[PDB]
A and B are shown apart, each in its own frame.
Chain A
């Protein structure tokens, strides 16, 4: 009734509460994005290329 009437759901005291802990499903470190993979590749490449120009001069 409270939800269908848009009243404070918290007013109804739950009979009991339970805490479930979720410690993260393992997907690896969050670098596995195709766009980001190019971002790290290009970022590294730009520094490397500049280093080359630093040597060639």
Chain B
């Protein structure tokens, strides 16, 4: 099963369809963050949620799509570099695991596979966790500065629509610009 072993993990990462764990983490985290500004306006600005719920949700759903559209692209760019930077230690961990195998006639493809398997995991993970942190940082920080300084002279309603649409849209554009 040498051919399948090397393929399985590699295929799922490179595929344009998000891995089940990646999709839930990205979509859910984007949803939670998109809603967080609702609590700012609801509490500080004192904007009723129930009466405007129709608008509130629409903008939240729109934000989630763009933020997740930022997660995949931002993570992809980081993973390219991360994998190499983490390979140094991860290679030691894999080689030690292969020394335990002690396979007399181990294939060279298997030699690449094992190291590749762990190297993929770490790059896939460290990129996901860090990328989510950074993207969440930019989105939450942007709304704070824009809403409370840039939009200081506008109705809360126009402020919410402009701030949420702008932050998410710009952040998505920065995702592709990094690539």
**Contact residues of A with B, CB < 8 Å?**
34, 37-38, 41-42, 44-45, 48-49, 51-52, 55-57
Contacts and interface: CB of A to CB of B under 8 A. Distances in A.
Interface in B136-152: 137-138, 140-141, 144-145, 148-149
Contacts of B81: 55-57
Given A34-B148, A37-B148, A38-B149, A52 B141 contact: no
A41 B78 contact: no
Nearest to A41: B141
Interface in B151-167: none
B138 A45 contact: yes
A34 B134 CA distance: 22
Contact of B141 (A44, A51, A55, A56): A44
A52 B134 CA distance: 8
B103 to A, nearest CB: 35
**Would you call the interface of chain B mostly helix, strand, loop, or mixed?**
helix
B130 A41 contact: no
**Would you call the interface of chain A mostly helix, strand, loop, or mixed?**
helix
Nearest to A42: B141
A40 B78 CA distance: 25
Residue picked from A42, A48, A55, A56, most chain B C-beta under 10 Å:
A55
Interface string B100-140: 00000000000000000000000000000010011001101
Contacts of B145: 38, 41-42
Given A55-B78, A56-B77, A56-B81, A48 B133 contact: yes
A44 B136 CA distance: 11
Contacts of B141: 38, 41-42, 44-45
A34 B22 CA distance: 35
Given A38-B145, A41-B140, A49 B134 contact: yes
B68 interface: no
Given A38-B141, A38-B149, A55-B82, 13 more contacts: A37-B144, A38-B144, A38-B145, A41-B137, A41-B141, A44-B137, A45-B138, A51-B134, A52-B130, A55-B85, A55-B130, A56-B77, A56-B178
